[PDB]
Design an enzyme around this catalytic site. Structure first.
Site, mmCIF file in Angstrom:
data_model
loop_
_atom_site.group_PDB
_atom_site.id
_atom_site.type_symbol
_atom_site.label_atom_id
_atom_site.label_comp_id
_atom_site.label_asym_id
_atom_site.label_seq_id
_atom_site.Cartn_x
_atom_site.Cartn_y
_atom_site.Cartn_z
ATOM 1 N N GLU A 197 23.851 9.590 5.117
ATOM 2 C CA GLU A 197 22.549 9.573 4.156
ATOM 3 C C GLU A 197 23.267 8.973 2.663
ATOM 4 O OE1 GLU A 197 22.961 12.686 5.729
ATOM 5 O OE2 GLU A 197 21.059 12.963 6.595
ATOM 6 N N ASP A 238 -0.038 -7.796 2.068
ATOM 7 C CA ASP A 238 0.753 -6.410 1.768
ATOM 8 C C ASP A 238 2.135 -6.227 1.933
ATOM 9 O OD1 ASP A 238 0.460 -3.390 1.904
ATOM 10 O OD2 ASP A 238 -0.175 -3.465 3.896
ATOM 11 N N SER A 287 3.870 2.883 8.088
ATOM 12 C CA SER A 287 3.498 1.767 7.191
ATOM 13 C C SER A 287 4.851 1.428 6.173
ATOM 14 C CB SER A 287 2.661 2.532 5.715
ATOM 15 O OG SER A 287 1.568 2.715 6.428
ATOM 16 N N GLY A 288 4.973 0.058 6.147
ATOM 17 C CA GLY A 288 6.053 -0.324 5.379
ATOM 18 C C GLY A 288 7.419 -0.699 6.222
ATOM 19 N N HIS A 331 0.749 -1.389 0.052
ATOM 20 C CA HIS A 331 -0.060 -0.137 -0.012
ATOM 21 C C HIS A 331 0.849 1.452 0.140
ATOM 22 C CE1 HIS A 331 0.357 -0.020 4.371
ATOM 23 N NE2 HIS A 331 0.293 1.359 4.521
ATOM 24 N N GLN A 361 -0.032 6.085 11.053
ATOM 25 C CA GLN A 361 0.216 6.561 9.679
ATOM 26 C C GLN A 361 1.376 7.079 9.608
ATOM 27 O OE1 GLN A 361 -2.468 10.074 8.910
ATOM 28 N NE2 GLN A 361 -3.070 9.446 10.871
ATOM 29 N N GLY A 362 2.130 6.821 8.620
ATOM 30 C CA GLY A 362 3.592 7.341 8.334
ATOM 31 C C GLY A 362 4.592 6.182 8.711
HETATM 32 N N1 ESI Z 1 -2.824 1.225 14.570
HETATM 33 C C1 ESI Z 1 -1.976 0.703 13.688
HETATM 34 N N2 ESI Z 1 -0.825 0.045 13.922
HETATM 35 C C2 ESI Z 1 -1.859 1.523 12.280
HETATM 36 C C3 ESI Z 1 -2.755 2.538 12.104
HETATM 37 C C4 ESI Z 1 -2.432 2.834 10.737
HETATM 38 C C5 ESI Z 1 -3.074 3.842 9.826
HETATM 39 I I1 ESI Z 1 -4.697 4.906 10.695
HETATM 40 C C6 ESI Z 1 -2.691 3.991 8.789
HETATM 41 C C7 ESI Z 1 -1.709 3.295 7.874
HETATM 42 C C8 ESI Z 1 -0.850 2.417 9.014
HETATM 43 C C9 ESI Z 1 -1.295 2.116 10.281
HETATM 44 S S1 ESI Z 1 -0.563 0.926 11.282
HETATM 45 CA CA CA Z 2 18.815 13.623 7.400
#
Ligand code: ESI
Ligand code: CA
Ligand code: CL
Length: 223
Positions: free
Chosen positions: A62, A84, A177-178, A40, A174-175
């Protein structure tokens, strides 16, 4: 990461930031030319940023490398988030050292109770929006399948697992992810989804990497 702590510069050398003019997802370096992230997080124009701590300041260490190709799992379902996972091949190989190193893939799945390290530059508020400049960390255990299924009935597949705290307060968001979920030095999870962030009885759900090792190996071997 909500309720976590500042990791310390370069203490998580396999962590990467996927950037398109701003940080939008995390990922893990598994060898010098490949990164694993969440399906995603897919988009075009991804620049992989290795050796980062403060993502808004060039502090040294970096390495900014463009992605040559992103391979989303063929059976990825965006409605259920089953499968995913995504692999990114780098345009040139990264120079590995003590600040940029790869993480190993697991040989077996992890058990409930295993304590893992989750990291990322995602939101730090459950109720609100605060993105950090430096990398945040959180130690969280893998929950049992019954607790996970009881928290998200009908939504957990065998390619997912829950990790976190049912009391709320500590979680990925959020942020993040991955990004990686590392247990005993092996990459066992990828930040995938959850209901809000750090809410009571709604732990985070992660992609179960042990189920994809042969797929990752075969795919890297043919690309
Ligand atoms: N509660 C969680 N661990 C997450 C909540 C999110 C959400 I909101 C968006 C994207 C990824 C995740 S992981
Ligand atoms: Ca930096
Ligand atoms: Cl069920």
């Amino acid at each position: 990461i909500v309720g976590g702590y500042t990791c310390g510069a370069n203490t998580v050398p396999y962590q990467v930031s996927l950037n398109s003019g701003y940080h939008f997802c995390g990922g893990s370096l598994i060898n010098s030319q490949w990164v694993v992230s969440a399906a995603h997080c897919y988009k075009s124009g991804i620049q992989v940023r290795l050796g980062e701590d403060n993502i808004n300041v060039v502090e040294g260490n970096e390495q900014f490398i463009s992605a040559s190709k992103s391979i989303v799992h063929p059976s990825y379902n965006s409605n259920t988030l089953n499968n995913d996972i995504m692999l990114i091949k780098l345009k040139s190989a990264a120079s590995l050292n003590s600040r940029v190193a790869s993480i190993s893939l697991p040989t077996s799945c992890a058990s409930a109770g295993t304590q893992c390290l989750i990291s990322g530059w995602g939101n730090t508020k459950s109720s609100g929006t605060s993105y950090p400049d430096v990398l945040k960390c959180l130690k969280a255990p893998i929950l049992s399948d019954s607790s996970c299924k009881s928290a998200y009935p009908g939504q957990i597949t065998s390619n997912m697992f829950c990790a976190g705290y049912l009391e709320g307060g500590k979680d990925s968001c959020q942020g993040d992810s991955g990004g990686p979920v590392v247990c005993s030095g092996k990459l066992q999870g990828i930040v995938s989804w959850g209901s809000g962030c750090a809410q009571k009885n709604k732990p985070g759900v992660y992609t179960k990497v042990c189920n994809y090792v042969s797929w990752i190996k075969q795919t890297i071997a043919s690309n």
